[PDB]
Structure formats: structure tokens, C-alpha cells
């Protein structure tokens, strides 16, 4: 992306170096009193919360380029007790104290609008998922999640739309969930060929995840028009 590239280089101009992370590493953890603005240039991360019996809660996933912030920008107080785990093999991320963020954006409104419209997407993204889930239950949630893997990591092939994901990432991902995927298999909306995963009926996914499909058209139109 161009906007993200302009932010990458704007960060480096101001002396902020990238930092390579590896799978299962933590970019920041819930006990770090320092609040950060993570610019995940490349890689895949997940935001986890730990209940007080030890159970890890996978709450959200992020793909670079994107912005994650552990503190409110105004008061510089914590958004919550969260960790940012890297689940890809290797992820690049610019780590920035929240204090320095306000200074970088105060000088330049353009990158302020970039970070600002990024949070705008995340808000509407969640509203669109919740919408589809309230209209079609888990069916909408499954089709919506499946629509992500198609619009982003998808590519057109003879056997449909293949998911360009190292199966290391795939299995990173239940009775009712099996029922849904089962029907998708029998209707061949998806497949299991060559150990891969292809999507052949994108129109089906759009039907039961319509609001999320709208979110792409409005927030990621270049990706949306690719497979449309």
C-alpha cells in the first residue's frame, strides 16, 4: 500500500528503526506500563487477553500494514490489559512510545489522517461483523471470516480461489461449527484439493456476510474490486 509505505518511511526519517519479530514473540504484554503505537508493516499478529485462570483469549488478528495502540492518545492511559503475539513466522513492526506518536502526528496531518482512518476502519469492521452475526448467527461469522481469507489471501486459479496461506498459518484458525463447514463442503463453496483450500462460490459468502462485504467495498475497495 502507498499510504502505509509513506508512513513506513516517515517513521524511518524521524529515526524510528524497524524491529523484526518471530513467531510466538510478544511485541508488548499486558504488564508493560509503557503504552505503545505498533506499526505492523509486515507479518501477522493476534491480540490476546488472559483470564485469571490462565486461558489465552484470541480476541483480534492484524495483518501488516496496520496500527495497534495500547494507550489512549489523549491521556496516555492504557486501553486494556492485552498482549500482541506474533503468529506468522516473522513480522516487522515499528515500536513507538505513545508519547512520541503525538509529536510525529502533530507535525504532519497526512499521517494523522492515516492513523485516524485506520481506527475508523477497525470500528466499522467490527460493526459489520457483529451485524452479519446478528443476522445469520455463526453462519454469517463463518462466511465473513471465510470472506476475509478470500479477499486478502485469495487468488484466482483453475480450481477456484486458492488461499495463499502457508498451512502453518491455516491450522492456527465446535460441533455447530462443524455443521456449517460441512454444508459448505457438500455445496462445494469450498474444497480440500491437493491439501489446499479453494473458494469457488464467493457469491455464497457475500450473501450471509453482506455487511462485511460492504465493509470491504467501502474500506478496501482495491481488494474488493479484485475479485469482483
Ligand X SMILES: O=C(O)[C@@H]1CSc2c(C3CC3)c(Cc3cnc4ccccc4c3)cc(=O)n21
Determine how β-strand 56-63 pairs with β-strand 19-22: unpaired
Which residues, in sequence order, are CB contacts of 176 under 8 Å at separation 6+? Answer: 138
Contact call for residue 145 and ligand X (CB under 6 A)? yes
| Terminal Cα-to-Cα distance of the chain (whole angstroms) | 20
Tell me the residue length of the chain: 228
Contact call for residue 130 and ligand X (CB under 6 A)? yes
Q: How far is the CB of 98 from a copy of itself (least distance, A)?
A: 11
Contact call for residue 78 and a copy of itself (CB under 8 A)? yes
Q: How far is the CB of 129 from ligand X (least distance, A)?
A: 4
Q: How far apart are CA 76 and CA 135, in angstroms?
A: 37
Here the cell at position 135 is 443476522
**Which of residues 141, 147, 154, 210 is near ligand X by CB under 6 A?**
141
Q: Please, what is the Cα angle at 82 between 77 and 84, to 5 degrees?
A: 115
H/E element, 60: strand 56-63
Report what 72 binds from Na ion, ligand X, a copy of itself, none; CB cut-off 5-8 Å by kind. a copy of itself
Q: Which residue is nearest to Na ion (CB)?
A: 70
Q: How far is the CB of 155 from a copy of itself (least distance, A)?
A: 27
Contact call for residue 118 and Na ion (CB under 5 A)? no
Nearer to ligand X, 129 or 162 (CB): 129
Q: Scan residues 7-36 and list those touching ligand X (CB under 6 A).
A: none
H/E element, 141: helix 109-151
Contact call for residue 121 and a copy of itself (CB under 8 A)? yes
Residues lying near Na ion in the complex (CB under 5 A) are found at 30, 35, 70
Amino acid at each position: 500500500n502507498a499510504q502505509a509505505e509513506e508512513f513506513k518511511k516517515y517513521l524511518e526519517t524521524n529515526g524510528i528503526k524497524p524491529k523484526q519479530f518471530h513467531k510466538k514473540e510478544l511485541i508488548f504484554n499486558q504488564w508493560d506500563p509503557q503504552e505503545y503505537c505498533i506499526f505492523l508493516y509486515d507479518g501477522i499478529t493476534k491480540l490476546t487477553s488472559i483470564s485469571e485462570n490462565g486461558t489465552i483469549m484470541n480476541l483480534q488478528y492484524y495483518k501488516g500494514a496496520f496500527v495497534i495502540m495500547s494507550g489512549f492518545i489523549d491521556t496516555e492511559t492504557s486501553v486494556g490489559y492485552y498482549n500482541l503475539e506474533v503468529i506468522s513466522e516473522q513480522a516487522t513492526a515499528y515500536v513507538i512510545k505513545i508519547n512520541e506518536l503525538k509529536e510525529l502526528l502533530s507535525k504532519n496531518l497526512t499521517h494523522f489522517f492515516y492513523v485516524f482512518q485506520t481506527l475508523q476502519k477497525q470500528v466499522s469492521y467490527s460493526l459489520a461483523k457483529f451485524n452479519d452475526f446478528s443476522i445469520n448467527g455463526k453462519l454469517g461469522s463463518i462466511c465473513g471470516q471465510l470472506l476475509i481469507l478470500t479477499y486478502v489471501y485469495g487468488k484466482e486459479t483453475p480450481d477456484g480461489i486458492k488461499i495463499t496461506l502457508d498451512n502453518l498459518t491455516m491450522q492456527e484458525l465446535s460441533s455447530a461449527v462443524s455443521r456449517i463447514i460441512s454444508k459448505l463442503k457438500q455445496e462445494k463453496v469450498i474444497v480440500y484439493k491437493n491439501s489446499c483450500f479453494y473458494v469457488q462460490n464467493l457469491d455464497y459468502l457475500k450473501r450471509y456476510a453482506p455487511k462485511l462485504d460492504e465493509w470491504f467495498y467501502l474500506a478496501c475497495p482495491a481488494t474488493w474490486g479484485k475479485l469482483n
